[PDB]
Ligand binder design. Sequence first.
Ligand code: HEM
Length: 185
Amino acid sequence: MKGIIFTEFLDLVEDKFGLEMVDKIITQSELESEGVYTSIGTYRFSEMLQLLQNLSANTDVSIDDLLLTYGEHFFSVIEDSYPGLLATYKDPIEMLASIENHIHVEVRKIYPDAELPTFVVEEKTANSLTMIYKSSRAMHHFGLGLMNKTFEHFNSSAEIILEKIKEDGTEVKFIINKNENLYFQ
Ligand code: HEM
């Protein structure tokens, strides 16, 4: 895992739960880095899993909801760091169907040591998209938060249903349906 994921996450923990919680989940965790990360650094995901599990136990917020909130926050990091890559797309469904064969291809050029999930499109229309998410890190809700903000970026919204094919969240079917445009709301 790249260090930018660690630094932005602990920034969000400090922003939402306080600096003492940042020190707490770091103290409860070991952690070859010992809690010191750099943006271009490469660290084991087991470090992040410890940080998430300890934060969830301390705050009583599920890892699902913590990763969802973080995934939504990380879209703003994408907005401010790669606006040209984001400006390539004009439709949220087309962008999400382009994560595997374009977006994360560019990410591997940024970070050659990147450890990324796989997204496989099984069905796609103009307002629907079904993809299979596969990753040993089971960060489906991190991707869900990024998907939520992808639709928000294009002034849209979507119902996104997650079906865990493997119970540990390492294979998840995403059923994305752009919402009814309630034009008379
Ligand atoms: C242009 C926009 C995007 C940029 C710049 C980007 C860059 C990354 C980076 C840097 C990482 C961390 C890699 C590592 O730690 O080695 C990453 C991991 C991830 N990204 Fe992308 N990403 C982008 C669009 C998406 C979108 C839209 C989704 C939602 C489906 C997405 C779902 C993920 C997930 C779920 C992970 C966690 C790793 C895993 O699941 O195994 N990304 N991305």
